[PDB]
Design a protein around this nucleic acid. Structure first.
Ligand SMILES: [Mg+2]
Ligand SMILES: [Mg+2]
Ligand SMILES: [Mg+2]
Ligand SMILES: [Mg+2]
Ligand SMILES: [Mg+2]
Ligand SMILES: [Mg+2]
Ligand SMILES: [Mg+2]
Ligand SMILES: [Mg+2]
Ligand SMILES: [Mg+2]
Ligand SMILES: [Mg+2]
Ligand SMILES: [Mg+2]
Ligand SMILES: [Mg+2]
Ligand SMILES: [Mg+2]
Ligand SMILES: [Mg+2]
Ligand SMILES: [Mg+2]
Ligand SMILES: [Mg+2]
Ligand SMILES: [Mg+2]
Ligand SMILES: [Mg+2]
Ligand SMILES: [Mg+2]
Ligand SMILES: [Mg+2]
Ligand SMILES: [Mg+2]
Ligand SMILES: [Mg+2]
Ligand SMILES: [Mg+2]
Ligand SMILES: [Mg+2]
Ligand SMILES: [Mg+2]
Ligand SMILES: [Mg+2]
Ligand SMILES: [Mg+2]
Ligand SMILES: [Mg+2]
Ligand SMILES: [Mg+2]
Ligand SMILES: [Mg+2]
Ligand SMILES: [Mg+2]
Ligand SMILES: [Mg+2]
Ligand SMILES: [Mg+2]
Ligand SMILES: [Mg+2]
Ligand SMILES: [Mg+2]
Ligand SMILES: [Mg+2]
Ligand SMILES: [Mg+2]
Ligand SMILES: [Mg+2]
Ligand SMILES: [Mg+2]
Ligand SMILES: [Mg+2]
Ligand SMILES: [Mg+2]
Ligand SMILES: [Mg+2]
Ligand SMILES: [Mg+2]
Ligand SMILES: [Mg+2]
Ligand SMILES: [Mg+2]
Ligand SMILES: [Mg+2]
Ligand SMILES: [Mg+2]
Ligand SMILES: [Mg+2]
Ligand SMILES: [Mg+2]
Ligand SMILES: [Mg+2]
Ligand SMILES: [Mg+2]
Ligand SMILES: [Mg+2]
Ligand SMILES: [Mg+2]
Ligand SMILES: [Mg+2]
Ligand SMILES: [Mg+2]
Ligand SMILES: [Zn+2]
Lengths: 208, 68, 105, 157
RNA sequence: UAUAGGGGCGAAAGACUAAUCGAACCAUCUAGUAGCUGGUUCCCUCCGAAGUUUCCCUCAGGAUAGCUGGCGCUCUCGCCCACGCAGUUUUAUCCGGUAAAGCGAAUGAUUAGAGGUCUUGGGGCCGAAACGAUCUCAACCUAUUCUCAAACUUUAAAUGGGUAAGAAGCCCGGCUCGCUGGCGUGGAGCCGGGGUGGAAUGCGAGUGCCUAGUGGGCCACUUUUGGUAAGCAGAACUGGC
RNA sequence: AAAUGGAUGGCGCUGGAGCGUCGGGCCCAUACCCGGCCGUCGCCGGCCUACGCCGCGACGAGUAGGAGGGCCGCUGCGGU
RNA sequence: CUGUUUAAUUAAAACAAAGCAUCGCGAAGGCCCGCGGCGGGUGUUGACGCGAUGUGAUUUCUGCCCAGUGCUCUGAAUGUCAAAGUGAAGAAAUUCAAUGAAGCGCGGGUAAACGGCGGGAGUAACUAUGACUCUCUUAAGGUAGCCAAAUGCCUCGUCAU
RNA sequence: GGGGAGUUUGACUGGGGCGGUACACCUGUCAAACGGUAACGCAGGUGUCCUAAGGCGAGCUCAGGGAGGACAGAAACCUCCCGUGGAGCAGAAGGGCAAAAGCUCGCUUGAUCUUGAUUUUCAGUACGAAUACAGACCGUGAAAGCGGGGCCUCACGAUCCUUCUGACCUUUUGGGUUUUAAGCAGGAGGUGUCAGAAAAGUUACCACAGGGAUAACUGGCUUGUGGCGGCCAAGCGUUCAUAGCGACGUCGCUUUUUGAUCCUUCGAUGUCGGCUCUUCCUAUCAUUGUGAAGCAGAAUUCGCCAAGCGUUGGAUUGUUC
RNA sequence: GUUUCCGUAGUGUAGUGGUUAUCACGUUCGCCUAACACGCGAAAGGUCCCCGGUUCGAAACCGGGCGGAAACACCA
RNA sequence: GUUCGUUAAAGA
RNA sequence: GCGGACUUAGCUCAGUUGGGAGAGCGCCAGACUGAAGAUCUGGAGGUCCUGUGUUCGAUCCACAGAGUUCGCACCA
RNA sequence: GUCUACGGCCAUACCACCCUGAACGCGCCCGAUCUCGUCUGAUCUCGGAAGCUAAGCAGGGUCGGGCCUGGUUAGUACUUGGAUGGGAGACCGCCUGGGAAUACCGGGUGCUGUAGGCU
């Protein structure tokens, strides 16, 4: 395990797991939701998300350790089924390793300098959301403290923002309680379906 | 003993030492490459132009000098 | 590959498409008292060893198959050559194939 | 070392873009290609016979020879030494006209009509194509409403 | 006294053979050849590079092209308008597939929830058993949703490349054709005539011969390849050494 | 936290001689403008060594290399 | 063992040595020199001799393989095999056919000639180790002896002194 | 027939050798929206195959899925419907193709002979490949037209010599006949190091001309690796995170190890270890002064100011260790 | 570390020139034998290392991993 | 004029 | 490239002055035997390397080709 | 206001479903003896004309799916040229110019040439 000081800010083209790699090991993270997975939309009002500031690469093992720390603080603060955390970031970039000493000079110089697939990292743009936690109205400070504990574990400098939107949907929390009851938005599990007016009339007949 | 293999550095500056020249002028353009059936048309047409253009163009020149 | 026995190809004597017996071109035995053969024997005779170079590093495994085309028509007897691309196996004139046949290996 | 064959960089250039895969239209054929016509070169992946080369795509040439079902075009290609007039035989499907020469002939016909009108009526017409002039001292109008005050908005993430 | 140089002698070390021996000494061929080190002799004036394409048993070299110098020749101006050119812009006309963006759009990956009942696979109930009825689960489908792709793409920049901006261009009339063909139809060539004020800016242009040196490069902003990174190795434009 | 004793150049500097924003002056390079002189080049003047004599204007750096001039120099030869 | 050796970096575990053996040769011969001769050394010599070899006193020993590379012997019994010769075609150059000396191959011998000597799995009343037995394989499968040696990477192997 | 003689031991290469062909030709990317544009860059290929898998004409539509129909089941055959390339086009990919360039059927060799032009790498040279033509003989189709190989992008080769094919060809030397030989034009035999010499190894007995264009010492950049610290804290510490520790992640320092490059040194910088000897640093082993402990005392552990002074004798190994 | 070769029932293997589960042993059942070993007739035991691509059809042809076996790792 | 191996301590 | 040899049963061999299949080791079923070995009887298994031509009829006649081996010679 | 034959533009013109169609015209249709080719007059050919607009076809509609066009996204992501601008770097900000796309919303869904016939 090489340190994260040698795998850092972006310098190469994205090299994903595809037909051409064929040698990448499995990533460290596999799951992304840890809280109440089958939660509805009206259960947890607010959400806080974690905004990056530096155009950097985040490793899957750092994502693993951060989601474990955030899950532990959430189950200590608001208990089981009192939160819903989602890691928005997904690792796809595959770094390469040029290992040597396999204490002698007599194995290989820089003869074939192409790297075997070592691990999986994720390129992060400036302003791209790392994690997002939706909770109750009374759990405002606990999301801030959980993302603060994850801030010391992610590299680089990044900020926090409690979103104006109602959870994971792209609609505003002020217009949510005024607009989901009258006409448009119908809950679809944890997601929200937005219906336009350019539909067949049978959908409006099935509604109301 | 590895050396620098290939580059195009310091090439456009050598090109614009002399002001890269279009051929820019061929009055009565080159004729080779054109269709041989069209050449069999054109050569016989030119030599019969040399043969039989005299009297009809002469009378037409007389007619246009009489009119204008 | 496969070529047929007969083929109606343009022969240069009569100027028409006439059928041709197609045979395999023999390489031909070299004749003594040729120009280069007499020169090579005169140059080789004497204490000089091998004078002209002898080829060793052969790399191609196939040869270009060329066909001797003879005019079938009487008293013409025009012969010429037609070259084909390189092939490993070369059937002479038989064993044509068909699509609807069972494999039965 | 790039193995310079024929069309080694043409994954996108000799392709039909979108909703155009199929048979060729016949108005590409039904055109008048004579000598001296200034034409453009645009490669087609449908007819794999007489595409010129990957270098001559998008270029513009002059017609010197016309045959049964193709055409001959001279093209000024730039190489390392100097630009060269090169004689290419390109089929009809790869070639369209150029509207720039047609617009120039329209401008020449308009200049001839204005010159005939000038000789008829004694009017100095200024038939030269002047570029975009600087704007004159024009006059504005602001009646009914005061000009709207604008200030930059605060930063909200 | 005998063994004299690819010879001699050697209880063998390739040791000795006149201070030289894994081939003695002297002279001649011979001033052997070297793509390889070193050097190459007075002044002033003018012009002034390159470490690049391709080829070679080619990689310390050479040939060719490019860059350069010299020698000229053909013209143009000096006495309302000239011939022409441009590492430039503009006016029109085409060309591209990168940046970006998207995958509730084809291909490849990938996350989670919801609904539906076609289907088989695993549990449970009514119970001799029964697609006789039903709870649960998997797969599938539907509408969503998370995140991407140098070898993905509906769309699509900036930058960039070509062409035209006239007298070599238009219009009219007529001959020739063995090309073509309903037609004096079409197309090319030839002949005669009419009017040159047809974007901006700058510049006086075209062309022939001979030849040296060069063929080890490096650095800097920006775009990048490999590498953890390098005063590392390798590319693009421009500039400098 | 690093091996000789040393580095905003040192000396020193705290109401600055530090930091960030700037105002008015001041100093110079072979850079720029004017002027004197040399040379090269372009155009040109005169029936005064015509290979000489003047006139105007613009520029002069440079290794490898290439030209022109030398009333620079050494040795010898024929005229003088 | 005494002796000799790299004069001018080695004195030896190197060379030589007696002993053990092997092969060629009966003189128109073996091993060699010579540009040349029936010229010379061995040879003023004759198998207890000459010439070329491996090992290196004494004692006890000389395991097994001719598959390969060598060496040697044999039969024109038989394939291949060059000049010269024979026959045929023709005007001749030329062509063709059989005839086939050495050598190679076919057959035999030789290892005190060059050389070579195996990797698998299951098995005995605790566990292990494992004579025995099945199987692939070679030409033969390391025998008598000896050992981490001047020969063993791991290795500063383990035990005892 | 190495007893003796002459000659050779390819090239690229993050030193050479070994490994590999990046040595000849293709596909996509690198490639920065004309084109060109590098590395022992990435992912994959080629030295073949086809008398049809060529050319023409006609007919049909593919892969997959749904519903059915005895034996028939997940897959045997037939029918109805949906079915934009999701199949197939000889092979590695890219482009292109639906009354088609795909499948089936009927004839045919245009995969024929000949002279020029152009494109491709390019020096605007060649080879190979390709394009539009032109002149003969043709094939198919009712005709239009299409075809001088493969739907396109690669699948291949100079001088000299040999062989074969053609003219009712030329010369065979003072003149005739015949054989032979030479030539003319185009097909083949091959230069894979693929624009082409005919080629094994060692030198620690080595020699010469050169190179720091080029390795082995140090020194220089970097710190992968080694060593030494810090950050948030799930847990260890009987209870109790931070007395002492600290998993998962993460930020740094050093050149006391090792690695990477070749910047200097090849007309020489004497290359390990030990002895002796001087100076310096602290990341402190002890001593001086201190703080904290799960510090009762004793003995320890963790930190601070701190390099002033000490930091052994020996059996082994050349040893560093 | 580099280059080749191998992976098939409990064991060692044969076998692709694409289309069986093949051989001897190991186990079980039955026979003869007073009873064993031996002998005989059968039966059972396969993911042909794993995952993908090519094809009507793969263990086979190819690619990526795994677990092994050989050769080299030299000059200072 | 071929081959047949094993059969516990004893058997009071 | 020239000359010459061998291609047969599951295995190893025989077979022209051609009328076309044999021997041994293997296999099966009996007999003999207290049981095995030997022995005796009766069957199974040859596509005789492939194709063409002569013949009324080719393993044995001739030609061509396909695997293995032995010499010989080398201007592409 | 239309249709038929040949078309040009190639989805503003395709796909699913529901209505309308007076007169020509297009068709479904009625049968194999000749031309014709199939297992089958199903397909292709041959001489029609008893019905029908049920289907093909021509129109209209679907708060239709797609297509095109226009706002929003957005002077935002990007980008030519510049600085002794910031920052340890990662990048970011400014001068001068150019300036894209999806979700969101609104509008359309055929235009025509030649030749011929019906109200
Ligand atoms: Mg170079
Ligand atoms: Mg001789
Ligand atoms: Mg591209
Ligand atoms: Mg010695
Ligand atoms: Mg020696
Ligand atoms: Mg001496
Ligand atoms: Mg020597
Ligand atoms: Mg000598
Ligand atoms: Mg000399
Ligand atoms: Mg000399
Ligand atoms: Mg070179
Ligand atoms: Mg040099
Ligand atoms: Mg030159
Ligand atoms: Mg010049
Ligand atoms: Mg000049
Ligand atoms: Mg992008
Ligand atoms: Mg010179
Ligand atoms: Mg560099
Ligand atoms: Mg400078
Ligand atoms: Mg100071
Ligand atoms: Mg200040
Ligand atoms: Mg000067
Ligand atoms: Mg000594
Ligand atoms: Mg002895
Ligand atoms: Mg004798
Ligand atoms: Mg022995
Ligand atoms: Mg023998
Ligand atoms: Mg046991
Ligand atoms: Mg032993
Ligand atoms: Mg020799
Ligand atoms: Mg080399
Ligand atoms: Mg570009
Ligand atoms: Mg490009
Ligand atoms: Mg259908
Ligand atoms: Mg393809
Ligand atoms: Mg495709
Ligand atoms: Mg067709
Ligand atoms: Mg023709
Ligand atoms: Mg070459
Ligand atoms: Mg030594
Ligand atoms: Mg480390
Ligand atoms: Mg260097
Ligand atoms: Mg170095
Ligand atoms: Mg370098
Ligand atoms: Mg010194
Ligand atoms: Mg001290
Ligand atoms: Mg026993
Ligand atoms: Mg009938
Ligand atoms: Mg019939
Ligand atoms: Mg009918
Ligand atoms: Mg109806
Ligand atoms: Mg209808
Ligand atoms: Mg409609
Ligand atoms: Mg709609
Ligand atoms: Mg910029
Ligand atoms: Zn003929």
């Amino acid at each position: 395990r090489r340190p994260a000081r040698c795998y850092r800010y972006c310098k190469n083209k994205p090299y994903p797991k595809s037909r051409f790699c064929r040698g990448v090991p499995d990533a460290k993270i596999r799951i992304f939701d840890l809280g109440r997975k089958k939660a509805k939309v009206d259960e947890f009002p607010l959400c806080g998300h974690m905004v990056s500031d530096e155009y950097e690469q985040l490793s899957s093992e750092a994502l693993e350790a951060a989601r474990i720390c955030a899950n532990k603080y959430m189950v200590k603060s608001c208990g089981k089924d009192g939160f819903h955390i989602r890691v928005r970031l997904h690792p796809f970039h595959v770094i390469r390793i040029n290992k040597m000493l396999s204490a002698d000079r007599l194995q290989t110089g820089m003869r074939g300098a192409f790297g075997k697939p070592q691990g999986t990292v994720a390129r992060v743009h400036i302003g791209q959301v790392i994690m997002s936690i939706r909770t109750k109205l009374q759990n405002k400070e606990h999301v801030i403290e959980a993302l603060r504990r994850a801030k010391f574990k992610f590299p680089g400098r990044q900020k926090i923002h409690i979103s104006k939107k109602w959870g994971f949907t792209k609609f505003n929390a002020d217009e949510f309680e005024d607009m989901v009851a009258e006409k448009r938005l119908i809950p679809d599990g944890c997601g929200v379906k937005y219906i336009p007016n350019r539909g067949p009339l049978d959908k409006w007949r099935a509604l109301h | 003993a590895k050396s620098k293999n290939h580059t195009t550095h310091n090439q456009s500056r050598k090109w614009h030492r002399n002001g890269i020249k279009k051929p820019r002028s061929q009055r009565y353009e080159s004729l080779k490459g054109v269709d041989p059936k069209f050449l069999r048309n054109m050569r016989f047409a030119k030599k019969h132009n040399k043969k039989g253009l005299k009297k009809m163009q002469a009378n037409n020149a007389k007619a246009m000098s009489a009119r204008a | 590959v496969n070529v047929p026995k007969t083929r109606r190809t343009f022969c240069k004597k009569c100027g028409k498409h006439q059928p041709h017996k197609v045979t395999q071109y023999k390489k031909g035995k070299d004749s003594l008292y040729a120009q280069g053969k007499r020169r090579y024997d005169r140059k080789q005779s004497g204490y000089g060893g091998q004078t002209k170079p002898i080829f060793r590093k052969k790399a191609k495994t196939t040869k270009k198959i060329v066909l001797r085309l003879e005019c079938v028509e009487p008293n013409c007897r025009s012969k010429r050559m037609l070259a084909i691309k390189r092939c490993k196996h070369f059937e002479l004139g038989g064993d044509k194939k068909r699509k609807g046949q069972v494999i039965q290996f | 070392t790039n193995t310079k064959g024929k069309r080694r960089g043409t994954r996108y250039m000799f392709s039909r873009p979108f909703r155009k895969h199929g048979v060729v239209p016949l108005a590409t054929y039904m055109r008048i290609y004579k000598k001296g016509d200034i034409v453009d070169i645009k490669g087609m992946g449908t007819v794999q016979k007489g595409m010129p080369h990957k270098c001559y795509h998008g270029k513009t040439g002059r017609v010197y020879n016309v045959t049964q079902h193709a055409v001959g075009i001279v093209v000024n290609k730039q190489v390392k030494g100097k630009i060269l007039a090169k004689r290419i035989n390109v089929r009809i499907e790869h070639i369209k006209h150029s509207k720039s020469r047609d617009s120039f002939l329209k401008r020449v016909k308009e200049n001839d009509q204005k010159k005939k009108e000038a000789k008829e009526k004694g009017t100095w017409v200024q038939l030269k194509r002047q570029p975009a002039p600087p704007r004159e001292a024009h006059f504005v109008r602001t009646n009914g409403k005061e000009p709207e005050l604008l200030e930059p908005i605060p930063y909200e993430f």
